[PDB]
Design a protein around this ligand. Sequence first.
Ligand SMILES: *[C@@H]1O[C@H](CO)[C@@H](O[C@@H]2O[C@H](CO)[C@@H](O)[C@H](O)[C@H]2NC(C)=O)[C@H](O)[C@H]1NC(C)=O
Ligand SMILES: *[C@@H]1O[C@H](CO)[C@@H](O)[C@H](O)[C@H]1NC(C)=O
Ligand SMILES: *[C@@H]1O[C@H](CO)[C@@H](O)[C@H](O)[C@H]1NC(C)=O
Ligand SMILES: *[C@@H]1O[C@H](CO)[C@@H](O)[C@H](O)[C@H]1NC(C)=O
Ligand SMILES: *[C@@H]1O[C@H](CO)[C@@H](O)[C@H](O)[C@H]1NC(C)=O
Ligand SMILES: *[C@@H]1O[C@H](CO)[C@@H](O)[C@H](O)[C@H]1NC(C)=O
Ligand SMILES: *[C@@H]1O[C@H](CO)[C@@H](O)[C@H](O)[C@H]1NC(C)=O
Ligand SMILES: *[C@@H]1O[C@H](CO)[C@@H](O)[C@H](O)[C@H]1NC(C)=O
Ligand SMILES: *[C@@H]1O[C@H](CO)[C@@H](O)[C@H](O)[C@H]1NC(C)=O
Ligand SMILES: *[C@@H]1O[C@H](CO)[C@@H](O)[C@H](O)[C@H]1NC(C)=O
Ligand SMILES: *[C@@H]1O[C@H](CO)[C@@H](O)[C@H](O)[C@H]1NC(C)=O
Lengths: 184, 426, 185
Amino acid sequence: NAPATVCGPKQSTELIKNKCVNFNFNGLTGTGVLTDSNKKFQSFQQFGRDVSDFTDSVKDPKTLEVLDITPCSYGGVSVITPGTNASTQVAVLYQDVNCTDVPTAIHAEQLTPSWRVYSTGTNMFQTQAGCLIGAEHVNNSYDCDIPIGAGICATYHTNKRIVAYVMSLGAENSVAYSNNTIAI
Amino acid sequence: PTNFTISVTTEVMPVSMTKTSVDCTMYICGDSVECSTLLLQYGSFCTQLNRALTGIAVEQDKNTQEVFAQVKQIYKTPDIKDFGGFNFSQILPDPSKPSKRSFIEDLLFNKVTLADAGFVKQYGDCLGDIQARDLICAQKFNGLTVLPPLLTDEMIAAYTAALISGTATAGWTFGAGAALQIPFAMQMAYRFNGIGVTQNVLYENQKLIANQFNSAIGKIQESLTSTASALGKLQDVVNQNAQALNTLVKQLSSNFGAISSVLNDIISRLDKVEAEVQIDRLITGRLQSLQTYVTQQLIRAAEIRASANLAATKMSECVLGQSKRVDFCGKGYHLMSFPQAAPHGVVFLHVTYIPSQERNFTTAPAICHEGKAHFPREGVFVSNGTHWFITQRNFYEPQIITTDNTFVSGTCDVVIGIVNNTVYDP
Amino acid sequence: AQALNTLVKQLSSNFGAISSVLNDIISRLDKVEAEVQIDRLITGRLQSLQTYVTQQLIRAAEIRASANLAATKMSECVLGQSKRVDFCGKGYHLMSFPQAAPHGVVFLHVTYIPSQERNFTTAPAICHEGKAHFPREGVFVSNGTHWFITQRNFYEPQIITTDNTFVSGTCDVVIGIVNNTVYDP
Ligand SMILES: *[C@@H]1O[C@H](CO)[C@@H](O[C@@H]2O[C@H](CO)[C@@H](O)[C@H](O)[C@H]2NC(C)=O)[C@H](O)[C@H]1NC(C)=O
Ligand SMILES: *[C@@H]1O[C@H](CO)[C@@H](O)[C@H](O)[C@H]1NC(C)=O
Ligand SMILES: *[C@@H]1O[C@H](CO)[C@@H](O)[C@H](O)[C@H]1NC(C)=O
Ligand SMILES: *[C@@H]1O[C@H](CO)[C@@H](O)[C@H](O)[C@H]1NC(C)=O
Ligand SMILES: *[C@@H]1O[C@H](CO)[C@@H](O)[C@H](O)[C@H]1NC(C)=O
Ligand SMILES: *[C@@H]1O[C@H](CO)[C@@H](O)[C@H](O)[C@H]1NC(C)=O
Ligand SMILES: *[C@@H]1O[C@H](CO)[C@@H](O)[C@H](O)[C@H]1NC(C)=O
Ligand SMILES: *[C@@H]1O[C@H](CO)[C@@H](O)[C@H](O)[C@H]1NC(C)=O
Ligand SMILES: *[C@@H]1O[C@H](CO)[C@@H](O)[C@H](O)[C@H]1NC(C)=O
Ligand SMILES: *[C@@H]1O[C@H](CO)[C@@H](O)[C@H](O)[C@H]1NC(C)=O
Ligand SMILES: *[C@@H]1O[C@H](CO)[C@@H](O)[C@H](O)[C@H]1NC(C)=O
């Protein structure tokens, strides 16, 4: 982890940031997303590591600036399906992200248009387990059919469609307590 | 015994643990396509690992549902928390507080530290940090995620409040069929009859019993507030899960007999044929680490499932009923129990009857009167020194020995230790 | 079945060797070069077998716990009547009947579920002639004008007599006592 003195005859390439790309810095290759870094690094050293030996930061050889390395699609993605032989529509849960950060988190500009359909839409809302896209939030309460998590469940229909709702704990009941009445 | 103590004790039981999911391609190989192509030749290791972890994650929610969702009638919390002098206010939610939990539940949720706060981490918190690399960010960057439970803490607290309200208003009846209302003094009299004490003891000492119950609840509050390490089992569960995840993260820095623990160094320094050997060594080591983690998680899930089965049995037999099993729901004769929601567990508040202040008496197995042996129906024959009385076993209430208290079997020549006395006849 | 099928399908993995077929490795290479690939395949297949045996042991432990619970239910609900709440069905347990099932047992739990409740005015005790009368087995109920005694789980009103109740003390300490008459045969 020292500045390079002897290098090969490799030709450099302009920096591409906020995209999932292959990179090669001083012979240290890899694949990830490059972003501008506020990290401060001790001099005469090039790349930052982790406790799991993952290269998260790297000093640029030409602009002399540190850049973060973020793995492509590091967030969790879950897909909710009513099932084959029932439908082909799906709902996608992007775990622990905000709904406005979904295209940035999944890199929607590099995906297929079919995947770019589920990156945003009118049927988006935060569910405390992430952002759910492809299911509309109904105000009714039913029994759980597909457990999304954090009190949210999903089911087909309620034109059939995927809806998301807060699960119902049970039937609401009341017992009229009195100090002189009994029920036999 | 001539007196008694109303004792309230706590039992802490784990119910669920954290639901974790693992992406093999992110953990073993990261983003390199050469390692992914070489990992495709190892078959269905990761389908098996994901299936096992998904089964564990489903079983956690099944455990929570089996413990807390036994009754599907959400009874409303009563407006007046006092039921015949029994205060009940600290185990039921306060309408004047923004939290939907009770005071005891609020104390319990502040006792478990929950250092493994995955959810607190979102997108944008692991990126752009001013150094200070976190272990949760290293978990997320290597394909290890924590799934949230299906039931939130508010819904578990609502289930607990519904159970306590149903116990306070209907007693033991709503666990069998429809909720039949009953005054709480008569319900406690029935429970006293269940433990073997006549209901006149409960009715003549109702104020004292209610005061002892309130004092025991307050002592539970002070024991939870002051004494640390009360929720030891839940803290051990949280620590074990977090430390297992941290060990799985830290195992990625091992060479496993290869030239480096970094995949990119091996790929960038060697050609394809030489790199396949080192990448295969790293793949074998990381697959061994993942398999070890999944095996330990399965064993811990089995232990947690056994604990949750015991907790569900206790909820059925002590909250929804009165248990005659000795030491099943606290030391002493069990009266009633109240569940309390806890982080990854349940806390049972067991109300028990402990007799105290015993007094020596001279006793006889039977009374020989007019050549006939009289045996007590429910109780024992005691003597205060000059006169013989009959009293119940768990409380000294001396009564005149009459023909209604006793029954006649035979003659007073076979029973060993019989005592001649007179049996009253009204 | 899925575990066995996975164990079968795991035999087509190279585990870092040149081929997943032992015969190709033996027929294409000499002894010294083949020992490395055969050792890789042996290590991979032994790992697969060990994984299968570990999962089978854990599943056997779970099945053993379920079978212990089933044997306990057979002892306490088929061979007897259980007072444990919700141990053998919702409601008051009467009797149970086992039924043989593939790799298991099905219990038919016969339970008693009371229904059609009716509101009544109740009292903890009856004050008669300065004496407090408490019910032996049941509760004191009133239909509006007269006071009766009945069992808790079924409405069978009876005349409040000296045989149905017992006397403890005076009617001044019991909270909520109600003055009435106690019949004497
Ligand atoms: C039940 O116990 C609670 C806790 O001890 C009592 O609530 C407190 O009552 C005192 C005395 O009136 C007040 O100063 C406190 O502010 C109360 N605290 C809370 C958190 O409410 C309560 O009065 C008891 N209930 C009954 C009916 O006696
Ligand atoms: C060349 O390297 C120097 C540092 O040695 C740096 O300042 C400069 O931007 C690099 N590029 C060019 C085009 O001069
Ligand atoms: C994401 O949403 C959370 C609340 O869910 C909020 O605190 C946070 O500021 C949001 N982040 C951004 C970048 O808007
Ligand atoms: C659900 O109710 C809320 C108010 O509680 C309202 O703002 C919202 O529009 C409702 N949603 C639907 C789909 O009706
Ligand atoms: C039982 O103990 C309590 C608490 O000390 C006391 O107030 C009460 O008088 C005792 N009762 C008898 C009958 O001694
Ligand atoms: C009963 O008598 C025994 C033997 O004399 C004595 O040790 C004991 O203290 C007595 N118990 C009480 C409660 O007085
Ligand atoms: C025993 O009880 C009887 C009835 O109350 C009383 O007359 C007698 O004095 C008592 N004897 C002693 C020794 O306390
Ligand atoms: C009780 O034991 C004593 C000795 O402690 C003995 O003299 C007496 O006969 C015994 N009584 C009976 C009824 O067994
Ligand atoms: C008993 O009375 C309460 C309060 O008036 C009422 O809500 C309830 O329906 C009554 N129950 C029956 C079975 O009539
Ligand atoms: C209560 O029962 C008694 C005895 O059968 C009957 O005479 C009386 O009319 C009943 N009262 C009402 C209000 O139904
Ligand atoms: C029962 O409660 C009412 C208020 O609902 C009260 O007026 C009455 O005095 C209470 N009766 C008893 C016996 O506690």
